[PDB]
Write a protein that binds this ligand. Structure first.
Ligand SMILES: Cc1cc2nc3c(=O)[nH]c(=O)nc-3n(C[C@H](O)[C@H](O)[C@H](O)CO)c2cc1C
Ligand SMILES: Cc1cc2nc3c(=O)[nH]c(=O)nc-3n(C[C@H](O)[C@H](O)[C@H](O)CO)c2cc1C
Ligand SMILES: Cc1cc2nc3c(=O)[nH]c(=O)nc-3n(C[C@H](O)[C@H](O)[C@H](O)CO)c2cc1C
Lengths: 265, 265, 265
């Protein structure tokens, strides 16, 4: 990847490795969307659009030759920059085990948050529709631990009436889960009951939403399309610091809206 | 090519061959643009857009993460229909050499004219710019046969001052050429003089323009991009007739505007 | 060639190739002197002077030991600089076919003009004498197309009286050639007559002179001596631009002044 001009920066191999290994760890645990969707393999740094499969007509009614245009989806590209310090970085060659790298982490968190916002709520100027926008898949619930177990059993019937099968998964907030655990105290464990009602499912707690939703994981309903994965590169040299950046290119879409249910409580 | 539903029409092999061979001949001689441009090979019935290689910025000035969208060109698709007669078509099996096929020819001519209009004058709603739009490549001429020979020699100097080489070609109207031939009568032939001033070039007469232009043919300056070539297919059956159609998908662009000169007289 | 510090510039192989290929084309057609002289092979970046073969005496008349110094010609070295833009250059990796490179071309033209001026008119401070300085090889002509054909036939006799043979070539201005072509209109072609009078020669039109001259091309009368050919290198990096330069080292001389005739009209 020669468009990332790495070999013109005054660093060594050990310093490059130390920089990469720290960002990999945080990206592993802070990307919540990539836990239950599909990913389509990289195409390259020159890919530009993804086809939809239709045509719109722009000619009159009485003409002999008739014509129109094809339709597609554009990709999104991002870039974010930060700085580091050379004397502090150079203590690694004298044998120091712990070095200060706070700016890197602070930037990584914001990039992850930006990426999740599009999957959960969509983008207006690009023509993307998110999960929380389908308002014909909502059902009502209550505020006691009993209504949750009622609602799961009600949802599985609607799933069966449409032909959808496979393992099922629950995605829920964190404070509500803690409140439920506090309210149910001194009795049979609640995780066991929930997994038995799901018939061998899973629970995922996140701070990105405000209520709960239920999905199926047979495969082929939510797609994320990548051109280039997340990468780090070099920009310029200041008086006694260096400047680096992070980049990526992507888009997202939803195919079958019948494998998703929203709970309101 | 199974999207052209040919095998559901009540015809035989000889009738299909007779229909194809007549259209090929007229398409060979009525497509004037394809004589001096480049053609990029077919990509398929699902190709949708062609990339340009840029990005436009849509974020604010003070933000930490910045983003934009990629850019491309959409393709154009066309379709035209006509009808034929079964009893008249069926005399071919009794041994008749000449059959009436006038509607086919009348439709082929209009399709060819539509295709040439875009190359010579562009399309507003698709973002295409044509040859006659570059107004900084014009020079002046006169109305006598002497000024043409002066203008060619003047143009070759401007060609040499930019680094452009290769064989050269002249494209001119028809009535003006006939008038020049009438005005020069009883002297040395004019084609020989013109080709000697071009230093071994060629002359092309067409009814599509109104003046003359000079181009170079080294290769790599005018591109035509095809998805699917021109094809014939079947639609439905009327009381005692049949209905067929013609289709294609394409786009066009100009790379180096320095291999083109326009003459005004 | 390691004195051209190329590998310290933030560019890639494709960008270097794109920069070289454009300058080669313009240098090919804008160097007019190198069409009918001889070139002596490169000697290196350390060559400094070329010997003439004489000695001048600096001692008195009555002395017992007598001495002097040898004589030679010094070489000329040049350098010219320009700047380019990084974001615009970086669109080549996204797939763009046409990039802006105007400063390079504007500098190349001036370097070519500087080089031709020395061959055609000489240098005072270096001790070089040019072609248009030999005033004992001039003959007179007129302003009609007939006098040119008379003058060529007169010149070949003077050539034969000295022992000079070989193919012959005519070098002439451009506006005068166009005026001659306009004045001779409607008759036998003029290029054929001129080449027949030259007995199988060639014609070269240039904007560098004001009249015509006739030369012979048997070999060994006009020499151009090179130390290093034309080259491109890297200087420094500005805020968001880069700085590059062009260099060369040469000299020139005339051996036999009897293979050259000047026409005045
Ligand atoms: C013993 C010593 C070691 C130093 N080591 C480094 C170093 O590894 N990196 C660095 O950037 N500056 C270092 N400096 C400081 C450097 O000489 C200077 O302060 C700045 O590089 C420019 O003023 C060092 C200074 C001293 C006295
Ligand atoms: C001797 C004869 C031959 C015919 N051949 C054809 C034929 O080849 N194709 C056809 O469409 N109709 C043909 N017809 C006409 C057909 O029977 C009828 O007019 C229409 O097909 C429906 O009314 C023929 C009629 C006759 C009397
Ligand atoms: C999406 C995006 C892509 C960019 N690409 C480049 C680039 O390829 N080269 C460049 O010099 N600057 C680029 N810049 C601008 C760069 O971040 C910044 O403007 C200057 O490099 C220093 O301010 C880009 C900016 C954005 C937002």
């Amino acid at each position: 990847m020669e468009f990332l001009k790495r070999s013109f920066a005054p660093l060594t191999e050990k310093q490059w490795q130390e920089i990469d290994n720290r960002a990999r760890e945080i990206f592993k645990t802070q990307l919540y969307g990539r836990k239950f969707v599909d990913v389509e393999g990289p195409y390259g740094w020159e890919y530009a659009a993804h086809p939809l499969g239709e045509v719109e007509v722009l000619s009159d009614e009485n003409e002999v030759v008739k014509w129109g245009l094809r339709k597609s989806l554009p990709l999104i590209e991002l870039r974010a920059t930060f700085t580091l310090d050379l004397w502090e970085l150079d203590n690694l060659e004298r044998g120091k085990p712990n070095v200060d790298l706070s700016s890197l982490e602070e930037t990584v968190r914001k990039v992850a948050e930006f990426e999740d916002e599009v999957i959960f709520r969509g983008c207006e100027k690009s023509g993307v529709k998110g999960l929380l926008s389908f308002e014909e898949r909502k059902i009502e619930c209550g505020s006691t631990p009993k209504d949750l177990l009622e609602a799961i059993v009600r949802a599985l019937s609607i799933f069966s009436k449409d032909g959808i099968e496979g393992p099922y998964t629950l995605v829920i907030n964190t404070d509500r889960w803690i409140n439920f655990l506090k309210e149910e105290a001194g009795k049979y464990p609640l995780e066991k009951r929930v997994e038995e009602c799901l018939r061998g499912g899973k629970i995922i707690t996140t701070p990105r939403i405000e209520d709960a939703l239920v999905v199926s994981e047979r495969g082929g309903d939510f797609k994320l399309i990548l051109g280039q994965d997340l990468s780090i590169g070099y920009e310029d040299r200041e008086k006694d610091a260096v400047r680096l950046f992070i980049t990526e290119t992507f888009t997202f879409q939803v195919v079958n809206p019948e494998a998703l249910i929203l709970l309101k409580f």
